[PDB]
C-alpha cells in the first residue's frame, strides 16, 4: 500500500530594521599591553590556538539583521 | 505499493534594513603593545595557530544583513 | 513497485539593504608594536600559522549582505 510523506513548510517571515541615522561613534580605548611568556609550545592532532592577541574592533553594521533556519527530512541518522 | 517522498518547502523570507545615514565613526585606539616569548614551537598534524597579533578593524557595512539556511533530505548518515 | 523521491524546495527570499549615505569614517589607531621572540620553530603535517602580525583594516562595503544556502539529497554518508 501507499506511503506518502510530504515535507512542505511555508516561510513568509521577515527580519527587518529601520534606523533614522547611526550617530557619532568613538572607539578610543587606551593602548593595551599583552605579554605572553612560555618555554615550549607542542601541538598535535587538530589543535587550534591564538596566543598574545590585542584586537580593537568597531563593527556598526546599519542593518546587522540575521536569519538562520535548518530544514531536515531524515530516515536514519 | 508506492513510496512517495516529497520535499517541497516554500521560502518567501526577507532579511532587510533601511538606514537613513551611517554616521561619523572614529576608530582611534591608543597604540597597543604585544610581546610573546618562547624557546620552542613544535606543531604536527593539522595544527592552526596565530601568535603575536595586533588587529585594528573598522567594519561598517551599511547592510551587513545575513540569511543562513540549510535543506537536508537524507536516508542514512 | 514505484519509489518516487522528489526534492523541489522553492526559494523566493530576499536579503537587502537601503542606506542613504555612508558617512565619514576615521580609522586612525595609534602606531602598534608587536615583538615575537623564539629560539626554534618546527612545523610538520598540514600545519598553518601566522606569527607577528599588525593588521589595520577598514572594510565599509555599502552592502555587505550575504546569503548562505546548502541543499542535500543523499543516500549514505
Residue numbers in the entry:
A (entry chain A), B (entry chain B), C (entry chain C): 273 to 274, 306 to 380
Anything the authors wrote about it?
The formation of amyloid filaments through templated seeding is believed to underlie the propagation of pathology in most human neurodegenerative diseases. A widely used model system to study this process is to seed amyloid filament formation in cultured cells using human brain extracts. Studying templated seeding in cultured cells, and determining the structures of the resulting filaments, can thus provide insights into the cellular aspects underlying neurodegenerative diseases.
Although the resulting filament structures differed from those of the brain seeds, some degrees of structural templating were observed.
